[PDB]
Amino acid sequence: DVPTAAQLTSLLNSLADPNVSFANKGSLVEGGIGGTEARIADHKLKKAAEHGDLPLSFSVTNIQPAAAGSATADVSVSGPKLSSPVTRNVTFVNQGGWMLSRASAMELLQAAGN
């Protein structure tokens, strides 16, 4: 079993939602988001809003399996700040719906700024 493109971009959308604090995005990431982890993602999203970086847009391709019921995908992110899209390969995990792996979620977090 593999997630559909729509499932993943719907997930990345919710993650990317500035109206919602990451304390309430726990359900979207593997193992949830600690009070540390969450405070950073809140600030970086916050800063990206203030700089007009949003809304981000995600095209997902190259869905692939992984062990222990995980999946791989290439997500390309666009936005009014990004002259050309940025593509990462991140892995998702599926426990009651699909979520960003904890690895890939600390990965994207680290890579977004500062």
CATH of the domain at 14: 3.10.450
Measured between alpha carbons, how far is 1 from 69 in angstroms, rounded to an integer? 8
Check: CB of residue 72 under 8 Å from CB of residue 65: yes
Number of domains the chain is built from: 1
Instruction: Measure CA 51 to chain center.
Output: 19
Task: Tell me which residue of 8, 4, 1 sits closest to 100, measured CA to CA.
Answer: 8
- State both tokens at 110: 């680290």
Check: CB of residue 60 under 8 Å from CB of residue 75: yes
Amino acid at 34: G
Check: CB of residue 33 under 8 Å from CB of residue 26: yes
Resolution rounded to one decimal, in angstroms: 2.7
- State both tokens at 36: 């540390």
| Residue range(s) defining the domain that contains residue 96 | 5-111
